[PDB]
């Protein structure tokens, strides 16, 4: 099965936000569904639960009357309306395709991160990372992209819009002493196709939609 | 109440028998608590392993035996392996809620080679024109994830403008880390070269870039 | 020369629907159809020669527990029919024909079609002493159960007495179960479960049921038979073919003395081995 969640952004305390997990791969409307979260302290917490679409919906005493879980048996999508948000609602929320008749917490996802801070959502500053020229190892090469001074997390970086899936590592972000992050991704590409292929850095910041493409060229400069 | 407590970090070797606990604060963990066991793999892969305090998923080997030891639960792994190194959570059922533990980080002795490969990048021409300078030292494909970062500029120790992240697991169960040196465009062009020193279990890897 | 083969290594991927009768449990299992699950209303009083349980089956009703599940799933399979005869027991002061919105048989409440939920009748719950003899000349299969509430407050709210008991005995057997109340995890939204039991009645035998609470009543019995029928767990489709041997990986021919696809077979299937090719000269 496959369940992908969306709804990344920044909210202020007392605000609202809707999360959605599009469940695919197997039969929907037959299994129960729930929402689970993991705080930045890596503490698991149960949030909500729905019974195949349900007359039965129950939330945690922390999130009763502030959240509401919904299900769409037609679109195969499960929604989670977060309302009257607090600072303590900051976590990566997971959508679980679990059925308590045989399994308790079987399927989890890659998560979606929502932050409730009240701070200003700022935009990243993308700078190109120039490839290595000399003192080679007979090896490929290393070029990348620098996503500097963004908040909040996360940012997703692809290469050639899904055409460069082999030899790329996206490194985690650093919480610098400014309340902002900084991420770096570097690909490994042979120097033979280094002056023939155009390599594009595609950064897409979901909270504040900054879909920027960045070209990394040898600049004939030192 | 509903406070679930367990161990924070354990370690074992392939072939040995492990046992994880799940203690309850309001009293004894009864069979009516339906102890759950999740498996936190890298890239946030929380796979559910055991439910009902003994019922096991169809894809989990028979080495995972769920039981109720003493006044708490148990996760016995008879025949531990390298693929069992992960964070394992417990979830006890109380008549109205679903509470979780803190997680027991299981360490396993294996993965023969964890030597890191280091990559260093100077600031970009666009960044230098923007009155900013930030060098990037990327450490990847190493195990375990315990390294010390050191930057050097013209044979002198550098400890200002350096923020560095704790290594996290990659997709191949190896660790990776990143170190950044924030400077001013004047300091970058005034020195001969900058070096990022990485040491991991005796072997020291340091790479140097120059403004040419 | 050449060498003829003696092992069937290959399969069809689909099940041939001849010459046996195949019954597909598209969204239902054999126990879901045996109890009468509202989404399993196609298989009521149906027949078969081989049942097919799919991995895509589910249950949209009361979470039920079946002790001796494998012992029940096998004796009904070889019966080859859901031949259910409504009986009409005497449930006096029982407030029968009950259900819940989780076992939805239409808009409002509902329950299983082959079993009956007996609530309280006002503020009274009498003790049950009913009997139903088997004067015919065939074995009877009676399906019943017991209710496990979530708390003592809904046990006292559905049944006057704080604790129940269901005793279903025959001239050679006796079954007495005491309910175990508990707020179990929400499966399909309910903190309650139900355990399912059955009792077989032979010719010359009389069925006796006794209870003082927490009884799920039957609406009749099932006509048992001794057939070549069975049940298979497969996700292979049904094709408009004719093949004697059936395999969970797809039907195979019976021309070779051995097979290599699966040890679980049905029909005039060859012997099972693990070797790949076996060639003999001719």
XYZ file of C-alpha atoms in Angstrom:
716
model
C 0.000 0.000 0.000
C 1.002 3.657 -0.281
C -0.184 6.698 1.677
C 1.281 10.147 0.980
C 0.460 13.121 3.209
C 0.288 16.814 2.312
C -0.404 20.011 4.223
C 3.040 21.323 5.136
C 3.088 24.929 6.287
C 3.409 27.373 9.151
C 0.509 28.318 11.425
C 0.265 30.576 14.440
C -1.309 29.567 17.767
C -5.080 29.636 17.465
C -4.836 29.038 13.709
C -6.131 26.249 11.495
C -4.753 23.809 8.924
C -5.988 20.729 7.047
C -3.834 17.673 6.373
C -4.610 15.005 3.784
C -3.234 11.516 3.125
C -4.066 10.075 -0.288
C -4.253 6.330 0.313
C -3.419 4.176 -2.704
C -2.167 0.688 -3.428
C -4.934 -1.383 -1.845
C -8.655 -1.252 -1.029
C -9.795 1.853 0.856
C -13.039 2.180 2.848
C -12.461 -1.274 4.369
C -9.763 -0.520 6.961
C -9.849 1.788 9.943
C -7.713 4.920 9.881
C -5.911 7.012 12.477
C -3.550 9.954 12.855
C -0.293 9.739 14.809
C 2.373 12.379 15.371
C 6.033 12.561 16.345
C 7.231 15.697 18.091
C 10.675 17.227 17.493
C 11.492 15.465 20.774
C 10.791 12.150 18.964
C 7.838 11.339 21.222
C 4.999 9.354 19.663
C 1.469 10.522 20.410
C -1.954 9.235 19.368
C -4.213 11.914 17.869
C -7.386 10.697 16.150
C -9.145 7.648 14.749
C -11.950 6.922 12.283
C -13.903 3.679 11.811
C -14.220 2.995 8.051
C -15.914 6.418 7.658
C -17.633 6.143 10.953
C -20.259 7.076 13.392
C -17.364 6.513 15.766
C -14.683 9.201 15.882
C -12.514 9.805 18.927
C -9.590 12.110 19.600
C -7.080 12.494 22.399
C -7.931 14.680 25.380
C -5.214 17.017 24.094
C -6.946 17.360 20.712
C -10.649 16.917 21.489
C -12.803 19.726 20.104
C -9.850 21.289 18.283
C -9.242 18.619 15.646
C -11.698 16.738 13.455
C -10.955 13.675 11.348
C -12.750 13.008 8.081
C -12.712 10.335 5.404
C -13.645 10.328 1.728
C -14.611 6.859 0.520
C -14.790 8.194 -3.060
C -11.483 10.100 -3.362
C -9.668 7.529 -1.157
C -8.335 10.411 0.955
C -8.292 10.892 4.727
C -8.379 14.444 6.086
C -7.435 15.930 9.458
C -8.711 19.434 10.249
C -6.345 20.968 12.800
C -7.977 24.006 14.430
C -7.311 26.209 17.466
C -3.641 25.349 17.123
C -1.053 25.710 19.886
C 2.734 25.665 20.026
C 2.577 22.097 21.378
C 0.879 20.874 18.175
C 4.249 21.059 16.353
C 5.035 17.562 15.040
C 5.325 15.387 11.946
C 1.889 13.807 11.576
C 1.462 10.318 10.137
C -1.564 8.719 8.487
C -1.952 5.043 9.388
C -3.747 2.398 7.319
C -4.278 0.039 10.261
C -7.090 -2.316 11.205
C -7.455 -3.171 14.906
C -9.199 -6.478 14.125
C -5.867 -8.103 13.171
C -3.149 -5.454 13.641
C -2.781 -2.440 15.916
C -0.269 0.020 14.367
C 0.865 -1.757 11.211
C 1.258 0.828 8.426
C 2.931 4.234 8.771
C 4.166 6.796 6.248
C 6.974 9.236 5.432
C 5.119 11.994 7.279
C 4.193 15.632 6.801
C 5.689 18.395 8.935
C 3.565 21.284 10.211
C 4.988 23.942 12.538
C 2.957 26.257 14.776
C 5.292 29.060 15.854
C 3.975 32.537 15.101
C 7.300 33.533 13.535
C 7.734 34.931 10.031
C 7.875 32.372 7.249
C 10.960 33.401 5.298
C 12.225 32.339 1.919
C 15.347 30.348 1.147
C 18.430 31.835 -0.475
C 19.644 29.419 -3.136
C 23.248 29.558 -4.310
C 24.928 27.243 -6.830
C 27.619 24.809 -5.719
C 30.326 24.698 -8.422
C 31.775 21.302 -9.464
C 35.361 20.186 -8.700
C 37.925 20.944 -11.428
C 41.343 19.377 -10.753
C 42.990 16.815 -8.441
C 40.432 14.301 -9.630
C 40.381 10.638 -8.648
C 39.483 9.302 -12.050
C 36.019 9.426 -10.519
C 32.847 11.177 -11.464
C 32.422 14.711 -9.980
C 30.550 16.563 -7.224
C 28.154 19.450 -7.829
C 25.252 20.563 -5.722
C 22.879 23.188 -4.415
C 22.780 25.294 -1.245
C 19.414 26.130 0.315
C 20.320 28.713 2.950
C 18.305 30.704 5.495
C 14.838 29.166 5.283
C 12.145 28.515 7.892
C 10.373 26.302 8.568
C 11.224 22.758 7.493
C 11.192 20.969 5.137
C 12.438 21.619 1.606
C 12.520 18.939 -1.097
C 15.220 19.069 -3.786
C 15.113 17.124 -7.066
C 17.510 17.101 -10.031
C 16.343 17.511 -13.651
C 12.692 17.179 -12.570
C 13.124 13.472 -11.863
C 15.669 12.633 -14.583
C 18.694 12.471 -12.218
C 17.784 9.796 -9.658
C 21.173 8.019 -9.487
C 23.916 9.253 -7.162
C 22.225 12.061 -5.221
C 22.267 12.633 -1.451
C 20.130 15.293 0.243
C 21.701 16.115 3.652
C 19.690 17.196 6.716
C 19.282 20.847 7.664
C 21.149 22.701 10.410
C 19.354 24.834 12.996
C 21.649 27.837 12.840
C 21.700 30.592 15.458
C 19.000 32.583 13.653
C 15.843 30.461 13.766
C 16.473 29.456 10.142
C 17.713 26.306 8.443
C 20.331 25.502 5.819
C 20.296 22.440 3.579
C 22.688 21.086 0.983
C 22.322 18.451 -1.719
C 25.146 17.144 -3.908
C 25.036 14.784 -6.879
C 27.772 12.533 -8.228
C 28.088 12.893 -11.999
C 30.928 11.806 -14.329
C 33.113 14.619 -15.648
C 32.689 13.255 -19.185
C 29.102 14.544 -19.420
C 29.949 17.618 -17.315
C 30.151 20.069 -20.228
C 27.359 18.435 -22.266
C 24.523 17.955 -19.750
C 22.603 20.744 -18.047
C 22.102 19.898 -14.371
C 19.261 21.749 -12.671
C 18.639 22.226 -8.953
C 14.896 22.060 -8.283
C 14.008 23.260 -4.777
C 10.345 23.324 -3.750
C 9.495 24.764 -0.336
C 5.967 23.601 0.438
C 5.202 25.806 3.525
C 5.963 28.991 1.566
C 5.738 27.902 -2.073
C 9.211 28.742 -3.430
C 9.601 26.509 -6.502
C 13.005 27.697 -7.737
C 15.182 26.071 -10.388
C 18.918 26.770 -10.193
C 21.422 26.009 -12.939
C 24.955 24.983 -11.942
C 27.517 25.682 -14.683
C 31.299 25.878 -14.898
C 31.622 29.661 -15.006
C 35.064 29.913 -16.696
C 36.031 31.670 -13.440
C 38.293 30.803 -10.519
C -2.195 8.827 34.583
C -1.124 6.544 31.707
C 2.660 6.963 31.772
C 4.524 4.306 29.784
C 8.188 3.798 30.626
C 10.862 1.614 29.073
C 14.584 1.616 28.404
C 16.161 4.371 26.312
C 19.098 2.561 24.688
C 20.208 -1.076 24.568
C 22.820 -2.999 22.607
C 23.398 -6.610 21.596
C 25.267 -8.799 19.126
C 23.999 -10.982 16.259
C 23.094 -14.353 17.742
C 22.290 -13.093 21.242
C 18.862 -12.822 22.857
C 17.418 -9.377 23.555
C 14.480 -8.403 25.746
C 12.755 -5.020 25.768
C 10.396 -3.886 28.511
C 7.318 -1.676 28.739
C 6.405 -0.525 32.246
C 3.146 1.173 33.201
C 2.829 3.844 35.886
C -0.819 3.372 36.876
C -0.178 -0.292 37.706
C 0.689 -3.605 36.109
C 0.605 -4.180 32.359
C -2.286 -6.606 32.035
C -3.314 -8.705 29.049
C -6.165 -6.177 28.684
C -3.555 -3.556 27.714
C -2.779 -5.075 24.283
C 0.890 -4.119 24.220
C 2.053 -2.944 20.799
C 5.524 -2.986 19.259
C 6.578 -0.661 16.441
C 9.906 -0.597 14.592
C 11.363 2.805 13.657
C 13.597 2.316 10.619
C 15.509 5.133 8.889
C 13.522 7.578 6.750
C 10.748 7.323 9.361
C 9.631 3.765 8.608
C 7.572 2.882 11.690
C 6.618 -0.719 10.942
C 4.153 -2.346 13.315
C 5.494 -5.699 14.488
C 3.428 -7.178 17.345
C -0.077 -6.507 18.647
C -2.304 -7.883 21.377
C 0.880 -8.356 23.470
C 1.575 -11.568 21.538
C 0.023 -11.388 18.037
C 2.710 -10.931 15.375
C 2.483 -9.479 11.869
C 2.713 -11.887 8.898
C 6.053 -10.504 7.680
C 7.880 -10.533 11.027
C 10.124 -13.556 11.728
C 9.457 -15.965 14.564
C 12.390 -14.541 16.541
C 10.005 -11.830 17.772
C 8.032 -13.404 20.617
C 5.609 -11.218 22.543
C 4.975 -11.988 26.191
C 4.126 -10.427 29.553
C 7.124 -10.628 31.897
C 6.422 -9.831 35.529
C 4.299 -6.702 35.867
C 5.141 -5.392 32.378
C 5.390 -6.460 28.743
C 8.295 -7.991 26.850
C 9.803 -8.052 23.362
C 12.157 -11.027 23.210
C 14.379 -11.223 20.130
C 15.920 -14.706 20.196
C 18.574 -14.707 17.493
C 19.209 -10.996 17.017
C 20.568 -9.964 13.626
C 22.015 -6.891 11.931
C 18.609 -6.061 10.416
C 17.128 -5.729 13.930
C 18.999 -2.503 14.788
C 16.265 0.138 15.059
C 14.197 2.100 17.573
C 11.353 0.067 19.073
C 8.307 1.718 20.635
C 5.688 0.342 22.994
C 2.012 1.266 23.110
C -0.235 0.184 25.968
C -4.011 0.272 25.632
C -5.923 2.100 28.330
C -9.703 1.905 28.122
C -9.944 5.366 26.508
C -6.478 6.366 25.225
C -3.443 5.169 23.273
C -0.153 6.214 24.866
C 3.395 5.593 23.672
C 6.775 5.078 25.283
C 9.934 7.050 24.683
C 11.566 4.418 22.487
C 14.350 1.899 23.088
C 17.245 2.474 20.682
C 18.597 -1.005 19.949
C 22.232 -1.104 18.825
C 23.643 -4.084 16.910
C 27.315 -4.871 16.259
C 27.890 -5.213 12.516
C 28.349 -3.204 9.295
C 32.087 -3.895 8.825
C 33.194 -0.683 7.066
C 32.101 2.843 7.967
C 34.916 5.004 6.590
C 33.661 8.510 5.692
C 34.096 10.272 2.356
C 34.354 14.057 2.729
C 33.344 16.774 0.263
C 34.170 20.466 0.681
C 32.657 23.368 -1.257
C 33.749 27.025 -1.333
C 31.199 29.855 -1.432
C 29.503 30.593 -4.725
C 30.258 33.619 -6.873
C 26.600 34.585 -6.476
C 26.960 34.284 -2.684
C 30.203 36.292 -2.601
C 28.467 39.040 -4.585
C 25.605 38.901 -2.042
C 28.070 39.843 0.755
C 27.995 36.341 2.240
C 30.422 33.446 2.563
C 29.526 29.915 3.639
C 31.731 26.862 3.138
C 30.139 23.404 3.263
C 31.850 20.275 4.632
C 29.780 17.175 3.873
C 30.553 13.891 5.639
C 28.684 10.846 4.371
C 28.701 7.045 4.261
C 30.210 6.412 7.685
C 29.326 4.217 10.664
C 28.977 4.721 13.587
C 27.660 8.284 13.603
C 30.123 9.697 16.151
C 32.533 12.193 14.564
C 34.338 15.385 15.563
C 34.434 18.372 13.206
C 37.317 20.830 12.923
C 37.878 23.680 10.464
C 41.253 25.245 9.720
C 42.221 28.434 7.874
C 45.927 28.979 7.122
C 47.116 26.366 9.651
C 45.183 28.097 12.439
C 42.284 26.599 14.421
C 38.885 27.979 13.426
C 35.924 27.755 15.806
C 33.793 30.776 14.818
C 30.827 30.650 12.470
C 30.776 26.836 12.614
C 27.450 25.053 13.075
C 27.295 21.295 12.530
C 24.487 18.735 12.697
C 24.436 15.417 14.506
C 24.804 12.527 12.026
C 21.579 10.840 10.941
C 21.021 7.536 9.190
C 21.031 7.501 5.384
C 18.926 5.287 3.117
C 21.676 2.623 3.266
C 21.734 2.543 7.104
C 24.958 4.596 7.100
C 25.331 7.981 8.762
C 25.855 11.379 7.147
C 26.605 14.836 8.517
C 27.135 18.382 7.277
C 29.300 21.216 8.594
C 28.963 24.851 7.548
C 31.389 27.744 8.021
C 29.752 31.175 7.843
C 32.179 34.016 7.140
C 32.474 37.405 5.453
C 33.679 37.841 1.842
C 36.816 39.616 3.105
C 37.986 36.763 5.350
C 37.497 34.270 2.500
C 39.780 36.099 0.048
C 42.428 37.060 2.634
C 43.592 33.519 3.478
C 45.605 31.018 1.469
C 43.191 28.084 1.809
C 40.549 26.600 4.100
C 40.567 23.039 5.425
C 37.852 20.924 7.050
C 39.221 18.245 9.390
C 37.156 15.102 10.005
C 38.354 12.316 12.310
C 36.510 9.015 12.790
C 37.939 6.211 14.949
C 41.630 7.019 14.442
C 41.602 7.832 10.713
C 41.656 11.574 9.940
C 40.264 12.995 6.679
C 40.787 16.683 5.873
C 40.150 18.390 2.523
C 41.340 21.812 1.378
C 39.873 24.334 -1.076
C 41.455 27.558 -2.300
C 40.066 30.772 -3.825
C 42.707 30.584 -6.598
C 16.250 -38.792 -29.640
C 14.414 -36.781 -26.971
C 13.272 -36.952 -23.351
C 9.720 -36.466 -22.100
C 9.065 -34.416 -18.981
C 7.634 -35.745 -15.714
C 7.179 -32.523 -13.689
C 4.695 -29.668 -14.128
C 6.732 -26.580 -13.230
C 4.451 -24.000 -14.881
C 1.012 -22.643 -13.982
C -1.806 -20.673 -15.628
C -2.127 -17.707 -13.251
C -5.930 -18.045 -13.442
C -8.320 -20.675 -12.169
C -10.281 -22.742 -14.692
C -13.939 -22.735 -13.725
C -14.610 -26.295 -14.993
C -15.263 -29.079 -14.327
C -15.836 -28.225 -10.675
C -18.060 -25.534 -9.231
C -16.036 -22.565 -7.998
C -17.378 -19.988 -5.546
C -15.498 -16.699 -5.239
C -15.389 -14.777 -1.971
C -14.712 -11.457 -3.707
C -15.371 -9.236 -0.677
C -16.242 -12.018 1.770
C -14.744 -15.003 3.542
C -16.468 -18.289 4.303
C -17.151 -17.281 7.910
C -18.429 -13.871 6.793
C -20.862 -15.651 4.461
C -21.632 -18.342 7.063
C -22.777 -15.794 9.644
C -24.613 -13.604 7.170
C -22.573 -10.470 6.867
C -24.682 -7.720 5.220
C -22.009 -7.266 2.524
C -22.019 -11.088 2.054
C -25.692 -11.453 1.100
C -24.816 -13.114 -2.224
C -23.761 -16.421 -0.623
C -26.945 -17.057 1.385
C -28.065 -20.683 0.849
C -25.445 -21.050 -1.903
C -23.531 -24.172 -2.957
C -20.001 -24.880 -4.173
C -17.339 -27.475 -4.904
C -14.361 -25.268 -3.946
C -14.328 -21.939 -2.111
C -11.825 -19.190 -2.918
C -10.868 -16.717 -0.189
C -9.161 -13.588 -1.505
C -6.653 -11.288 0.158
C -9.037 -8.418 -0.671
C -11.813 -9.695 1.607
C -12.974 -7.664 4.592
C -15.650 -7.494 7.291
C -17.885 -4.449 7.769
C -19.717 -5.685 10.865
C -19.344 -6.646 14.518
C -15.791 -7.798 15.363
C -16.215 -11.499 16.047
C -13.946 -14.104 17.624
C -14.162 -17.740 16.523
C -12.527 -20.278 18.838
C -11.592 -23.279 16.693
C -11.697 -21.032 13.629
C -9.753 -23.538 11.528
C -11.920 -26.376 12.833
C -15.053 -24.460 11.777
C -13.713 -23.146 8.451
C -12.938 -26.735 7.372
C -16.106 -28.613 8.376
C -18.336 -26.096 6.594
C -16.099 -26.105 3.504
C -16.560 -29.841 2.921
C -20.304 -29.295 3.369
C -20.360 -27.302 0.142
C -23.485 -25.330 1.005
C -24.930 -22.611 3.235
C -28.247 -24.484 3.307
C -29.879 -22.569 6.158
C -33.323 -23.503 7.509
C -35.048 -20.853 9.628
C -36.404 -22.455 12.793
C -38.314 -19.987 14.960
C -37.229 -20.551 18.563
C -39.285 -19.252 21.489
C -37.663 -16.004 22.637
C -40.335 -14.841 25.091
C -39.467 -11.561 26.790
C -36.265 -11.222 24.817
C -36.672 -8.136 22.598
C -35.128 -10.002 19.682
C -34.132 -8.741 16.217
C -31.441 -6.406 17.476
C -28.441 -4.890 15.754
C -25.920 -2.078 15.635
C -24.977 0.593 13.118
C -21.557 -1.014 12.579
C -23.118 -4.167 11.103
C -25.069 -1.891 8.785
C -27.696 -3.800 6.799
C -29.092 -0.690 5.156
C -29.640 2.831 6.533
C -30.224 2.286 10.232
C -29.060 -0.477 12.552
C -28.425 -4.050 11.494
C -26.869 -7.378 12.359
C -25.927 -10.722 10.850
C -28.678 -12.530 8.957
C -28.064 -16.020 10.418
C -27.815 -14.980 14.097
C -29.972 -12.858 16.396
C -29.120 -10.358 19.141
C -31.298 -10.659 22.260
C -31.464 -7.499 24.393
C -33.453 -6.921 27.607
C -37.239 -6.492 27.673
C -37.843 -3.385 29.753
C -36.105 -3.916 33.078
C -36.324 -7.732 33.124
C -34.148 -10.567 31.810
C -35.540 -14.070 32.464
C -33.471 -17.255 32.440
C -33.457 -19.159 29.140
C -34.707 -22.762 28.930
C -35.473 -23.605 25.270
C -35.054 -26.799 23.229
C -35.140 -27.695 19.518
C -34.957 -31.387 18.550
C -33.442 -32.871 15.398
C -36.205 -35.230 14.268
C -34.926 -35.268 10.662
C -32.317 -37.707 9.311
C -29.307 -35.409 8.875
C -26.792 -33.593 11.056
C -27.615 -30.042 12.161
C -25.132 -27.175 12.528
C -26.173 -24.448 14.992
C -24.164 -21.210 15.148
C -24.371 -19.078 18.299
C -22.258 -16.660 20.281
C -21.817 -14.572 23.410
C -21.534 -10.808 23.873
C -18.573 -9.099 25.562
C -19.536 -5.525 26.541
C -17.145 -2.630 27.119
C -18.035 -1.840 30.744
C -20.309 -3.074 33.510
C -22.520 -0.037 32.900
C -23.468 -1.181 29.387
C -23.650 -4.796 30.525
C -26.251 -3.698 33.077
C -27.753 -1.349 30.452
C -28.230 -4.039 27.787
C -28.962 -6.935 30.165
C -30.408 -6.496 33.645
C -27.822 -8.770 35.282
C -24.231 -7.684 35.911
C -22.847 -11.032 34.691
C -24.057 -13.352 31.946
C -23.787 -17.042 31.088
C -24.696 -19.134 28.021
C -25.030 -22.931 28.322
C -25.676 -24.799 25.048
C -25.760 -28.559 25.683
C -26.809 -31.672 23.771
C -27.341 -35.358 24.575
C -23.551 -35.858 24.246
C -22.006 -32.354 24.516
C -22.153 -29.275 26.752
C -20.720 -25.765 26.313
C -20.713 -23.136 29.086
C -19.052 -19.743 28.536
C -18.797 -16.755 30.886
C -18.368 -13.335 29.234
C -15.216 -11.289 29.797
C -16.116 -7.596 29.900
C -13.524 -5.044 28.834
C -13.013 -1.813 26.891
C -11.098 -3.389 24.038
C -9.441 -1.223 21.357
C -11.785 0.323 18.810
C -12.120 -2.033 15.854
C -14.606 -0.441 13.450
C -15.292 1.988 16.302
C -16.529 -0.520 18.910
C -14.818 -1.290 22.222
C -16.769 -4.579 22.309
C -16.213 -8.050 20.852
C -18.249 -11.220 20.335
C -17.054 -14.827 20.552
C -18.687 -17.250 18.102
C -19.395 -20.885 18.980
C -21.248 -23.764 17.357
C -22.892 -27.059 18.299
C -23.541 -30.047 16.020
C -26.771 -32.037 16.448
C -26.962 -35.662 15.278
C -30.050 -37.714 14.340
C -31.753 -38.853 17.520
C -30.274 -35.879 19.408
C -32.030 -32.839 20.883
C -30.530 -29.348 21.207
C -30.756 -27.555 24.570
C -29.862 -23.895 25.195
C -29.734 -22.221 28.613
C -28.706 -18.658 29.406
C -29.209 -15.800 31.858
C -27.654 -13.053 29.737
C -25.296 -12.085 26.922
C -26.766 -14.521 24.389
C -26.583 -14.213 20.612
C -29.346 -16.356 19.271
C -29.480 -18.359 16.038
C -32.289 -18.136 13.508
C -32.031 -21.805 12.500
C -29.445 -24.406 11.546
C -27.258 -25.429 8.612
C -27.761 -28.659 6.659
C -24.411 -30.462 6.741
C -23.172 -32.650 3.891
C -20.249 -34.979 3.082
C -18.816 -33.634 -0.184
C -15.518 -33.412 -2.055
C -15.583 -29.672 -1.352
C -12.752 -27.644 0.175
C -11.514 -24.052 0.499
C -8.457 -22.348 -1.012
C -6.720 -19.024 -0.305
C -5.920 -17.606 -3.744
C -5.799 -14.301 -5.614
C -5.710 -15.888 -9.042
C -8.582 -14.862 -11.344
C -11.242 -17.118 -12.875
C -10.889 -17.933 -16.581
C -13.296 -19.675 -18.963
C -11.233 -22.845 -19.076
C -11.522 -26.540 -18.195
C -8.818 -27.991 -15.923
C -9.019 -30.842 -13.420
C -6.134 -29.805 -11.131
C -6.385 -26.531 -9.173
C -3.403 -24.720 -7.621
C -3.266 -21.521 -5.512
C -0.818 -20.205 -8.132
C -3.186 -21.222 -10.955
C -4.554 -24.467 -12.377
C -2.109 -26.980 -13.884
C -2.531 -30.074 -16.097
C -2.477 -33.686 -14.888
C -0.448 -35.209 -17.727
C 2.822 -35.308 -15.809
C 3.265 -37.524 -12.715
C 4.674 -34.720 -10.530
C 4.227 -30.992 -9.999
C 6.406 -28.148 -8.756
C 4.011 -25.215 -8.236
C 2.381 -25.753 -4.840
C 1.820 -28.509 -2.297
C -1.761 -27.267 -1.761
C -3.787 -28.897 -4.550
C -7.403 -29.686 -5.423
C -8.640 -32.302 -7.864
C -6.848 -34.925 -9.925
C -3.486 -33.264 -9.182
C -0.093 -34.982 -9.492
C 2.401 -35.692 -6.718
C 4.494 -32.868 -5.236
C 8.290 -32.569 -5.543
C 10.855 -29.757 -5.525
C 12.990 -30.750 -8.507
C 12.715 -28.484 -11.524
C 13.056 -30.667 -14.631
C 12.684 -34.448 -14.799
C 13.217 -35.914 -18.264
C 12.890 -39.541 -19.389
C 13.898 -40.861 -22.796
C 11.504 -42.176 -25.432
